[PDB]
Write a protein that binds this ligand. Sequence first.
Ligand SMILES: OC(O)(C(F)(F)F)C(F)(F)F
Length: 256
Amino acid sequence: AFAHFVLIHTICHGAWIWHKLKPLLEALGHKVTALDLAASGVDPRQIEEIGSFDEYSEPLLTFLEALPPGEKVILVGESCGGLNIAIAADKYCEKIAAAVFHNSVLPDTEHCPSYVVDKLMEVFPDWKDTTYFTYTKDGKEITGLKLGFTLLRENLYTLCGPEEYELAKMLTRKGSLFQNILAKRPFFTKEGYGSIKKIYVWTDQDEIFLPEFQLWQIENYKPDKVYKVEGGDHKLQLTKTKEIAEILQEVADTYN
Ligand SMILES: OC(O)(C(F)(F)F)C(F)(F)F
């Protein structure tokens, strides 16, 4: 079967990390949309204009609003992309056949939206040469960040080629986890987000979202399906592109 995959990058990244995976899925017969979220990739906004993870998710929400009645998509989110999935599923659960988490945060419905991110900062507290700044938007002080190049090299793109790591140094932008805004956000609902099928893809070779955090998330909010990819790194759509496309074909053949 063919599905329409909507690929959702992580913060400080853009549609471009999917540049290898999107032609592979299309060569399998699938339709693929690779969005730039607010102030990400070649989106015209800067991060200081964005006051929350919900506003940051506007390109995905606008995309889902434009789907004609009865068209469903499979959302695929990498790293912080799981939070954009949770936001989208609370507005458009009928339009989501399934959600695939790719070395991604897995929000739940029993704790606050920031919960999984609070646990990530405890498991991975040293972001090496990542720099931080603050800005104010709608009376809230938000901590922005720009991922350090050594963190990019060693923890995110560990096993990627120098031409893939070069794209990350050239294209990663200032972003924000909006953690303090997520902490005071209403909880993801059981009827929207809680109702969708969740497929959890990960590698125990991930150098930022370490096995303790990912195994902690699997036990915290049980996925409908778990796939463990052997080897690769945090960017499995670059180091294990073929393997991710095979898993996504299986999800397409399972969830309607
Ligand atoms: O997903 C990241 O890019 C961040 F957005 F959380 F910073 C990470 F991989 F660096 F953690």
